[PDB]
Amino acid sequence: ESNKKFLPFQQFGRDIADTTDAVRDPQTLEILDITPCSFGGVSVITPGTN
Amino acid sequence: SQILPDPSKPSKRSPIEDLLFNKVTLADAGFIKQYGDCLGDIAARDLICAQKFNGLTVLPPLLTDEMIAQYTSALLAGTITSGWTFGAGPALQIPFPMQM
Numbered sequence: 001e002s003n004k005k006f007l008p009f010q011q012f013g014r015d016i017a018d019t020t021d022a023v024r025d026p027q028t029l030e031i032l033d034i035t036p037c038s039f040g041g042v043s044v045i046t047p048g049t050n
Numbered sequence: 051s052q053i054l055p056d057p058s059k060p061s062k063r064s065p066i067e068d069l070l071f072n073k074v075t076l077a078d079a080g081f082i083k084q085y086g087d088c089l090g091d092i093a094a095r096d097l098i099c100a101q102k103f104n105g106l107t108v109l110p111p112l113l114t115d116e117m118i119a120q121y122t123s124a125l126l127a128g129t130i131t132s133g134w135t136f137g138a139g140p141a142l143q144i145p146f147p148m149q150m
């Protein structure tokens with residue numbers, strides 16, 4: 001759910017990197033926010049294989 | 051007193067070091083900028099979350115500030131209680147006016 005106050009003539013929301021982050025549902029005039037799913041980096045710690 | 055560590059404060063830093071740390075403003079310290087913080091959605095999207103969402107990350111340094119402060123305090127104590135003797139071998143005691 002989005003707390004942004006869209007103007008009645010606006011349909012999309014963009015960010016700094018020019019990607020859509022807020023959307024309006026075509027059926028119900030409701031504002032939604034899109035967030036990328038969880039991600040991260042993995043490191044492996046090991047001694048020598050001998 | 052202005053350069054020795056202050057035991058009253060938790061981080062044990064001298065007043066001059068306190069002023070130096072307060073003067074410099076840091077953006078990201080390599081701490082845990084948790085994905086929960088970015089998904090908090092406080093309607094104020096900073097540049098850090100935008101950088102994180104595109105594959106750019108910042109790693110923390112190996113040595114913390116407390117360890118560097120400890121090293122500085124050890125150097126100060128060595129140069130005050132011994133002079134230049136501890137830099138070439140065992141530390142030898144000497145009164146400060148005689149050293150000066």
Ligand SMILES: *[C@@H]1O[C@H](CO)[C@@H](O)[C@H](O)[C@H]1NC(C)=O
Binds near residue numbers: 026027028
């Ligand atoms: C579109 O149809 C659905 C199902 O009949 C209805 O619930 C919805 O309100 C309609 N959309 C609009 C904008 O009226």
